[PDB]
Amino acid sequence: VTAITKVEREAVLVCELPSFDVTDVEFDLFRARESTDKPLDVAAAIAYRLLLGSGLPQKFGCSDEVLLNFILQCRKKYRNVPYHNFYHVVDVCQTIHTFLYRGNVYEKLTELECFVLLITALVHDLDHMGLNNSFYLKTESPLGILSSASGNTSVLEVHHCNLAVEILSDPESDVFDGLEGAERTLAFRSMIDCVLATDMAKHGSALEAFLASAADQSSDEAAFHRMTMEIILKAGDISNVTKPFDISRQWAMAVTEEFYRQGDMEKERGVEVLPMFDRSKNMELAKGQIGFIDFVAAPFFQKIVDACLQGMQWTVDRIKSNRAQWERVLETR
Numbered sequence: 001v002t003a004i005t006k007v008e009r010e011a012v013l014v015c016e017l018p019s020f021d022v023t024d025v026e027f028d029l030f031r032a033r034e035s036t037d038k039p040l041d042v043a044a045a046i047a048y049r050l051l052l053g054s055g056l057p058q059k060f061g062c063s064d065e066v067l068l069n070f071i072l073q074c075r076k077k078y079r080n081v082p083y084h085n086f087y088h089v090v091d092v093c094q095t096i097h098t099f100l101y102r103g104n105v106y107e108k109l110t111e112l113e114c115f116v117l118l119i120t121a122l123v124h125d126l127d128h129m130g131l132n133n134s135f136y137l138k139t140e141s142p143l144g145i146l147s148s149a150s151g152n153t154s155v156l157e158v159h160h161c162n163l164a165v166e167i168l169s170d171p172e173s174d175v176f177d178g179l180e181g182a183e184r185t186l187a188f189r190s191m192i193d194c195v196l197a198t199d200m201a202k203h204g205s206a207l208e209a210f211l212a213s214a215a216d217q218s219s220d221e222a223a224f225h226r227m228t229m230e231i232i233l234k235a236g237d238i239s240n241v242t243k244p245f246d247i248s249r250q251w252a253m254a255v256t257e258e259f260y261r262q263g264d265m266e267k268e269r270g271v272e273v274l275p276m277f278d279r280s281k282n283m284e285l286a287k288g289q290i291g292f293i294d295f296v297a298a299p300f301f302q303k304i305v306d307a308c309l310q311g312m313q314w315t316v317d318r319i320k321s322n323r324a325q326w327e328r329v330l331e332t333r
């Protein structure tokens with residue numbers, strides 16, 4: 001890995017981000033991206049501002065320079081795909097910030113764990129190529145073969161953890177360098193756990209485990225803290241439908257184009273192409289989003305809020321209003 005230059009940091013530090021409140025739940029990363037000639041710099045500056053404002057890097061001996069090196073080292077490893085690019089992970093970081101601080105989830109965690117969540121958001125999709133786990137397995141890809149051979153089917157999640165560990169192995173980009181002993185161990189293990197938990201094939205079991213812990217006043221503390229962390233990263237990962245409508249719709253366009261490119265590649269290779277990934281179905285954006293709301297996101301946010309995370313009620317409220325808005329698109333078509 002090649003060291004971040006000073007000129008690279010200066011480009012990020014130059015961004016003043018006037019008019020944006022990065023801590024707000026109605027913050028608009030799309031508008032932030034439009035605001036400038038250099039969206040990648042603005043994106044990094046948002047991540048930088050969020051991390052510094054939390055008070056957290058300073059507390060764990062992570063300097064301003066090392067924090068920004070880390071951010072830029074993550075940015076180098078994201079690709080130019082429609083959805084799983086650096087804007088997605090900056091969005092997950094910003095959203096998790098809002099769940100911790102606007103939603104009061106910080107109350108259930110330590111500050112180390114809060115620090116870890118904010119950083120894990122930035123590593124959690126490192127080097128995503130716009131193709132899901134199933135594509136690698138269906139096509140018998142080298143990457144997919146290695147996963148089957150070694151017994152872990154979370155193809156990309158394990159990949160992301162491996163690049164995260166690389167960035168953190170140089171002191172100049174290790175935001176956990178100020179830690180040692182059991183704490184540094186916890187930072188790496190909880191980071192890795194969280195990323196492994198974002199495999200959507202494990203979505204149901206992760207939810208059931210969190211919910212079961214949350215209902216049990218004699219749950220192991222460490223286990224509950226860990227499951228909370230995993231759940232908050234998962235929440236950020238599927239939080240598109242909890243933003244105001246046009247923000248939420250822009251994410252949906254981005255993921256739709258990304259899925260389509262996968263399906264075009266699957267067609268070429270002669271493997272199974274699902275409906276959601278097929279250009280020829282031209283499936284309505286409103287039906288896709290409502291199906292995702294009804295089958296994935298509304299039950300998830302509702303269950304985790306009722307169980308435990310009451311301050312996150314606004315996410316349930318907004319899913320409801322976005323669902324009603326998509327129903328209006330149908331009604332008037």
Ligand SMILES: COc1ccc(C2=NN(C3CCN(C(=O)CN4C(=O)CCC4=O)CC3)C(=O)[C@@H]3CC=CC[C@H]23)cc1OC
Pocket residue numbers: 198200237238240241248251252253255288289291292293295296
């Ligand atoms: C902005 O909009 C989306 C953003 C992310 C995803 C992701 N989706 N997924 C799975 C796809 C397969 N799944 C489903 O098809 C679920 N489902 C039904 O069963 C009925 C209709 C429906 O949607 C489970 C989630 C991913 O794995 C992506 C990677 C990680 C997290 C969420 C991403 C989906 C979105 O809108 C469809």
Ligand SMILES: [Mg+2]
Pocket residue numbers: 124125198
């Ligand atoms: Mg992922």
Ligand SMILES: [Zn+2]
Pocket residue numbers: 088092124125198237
């Ligand atoms: Zn993600």
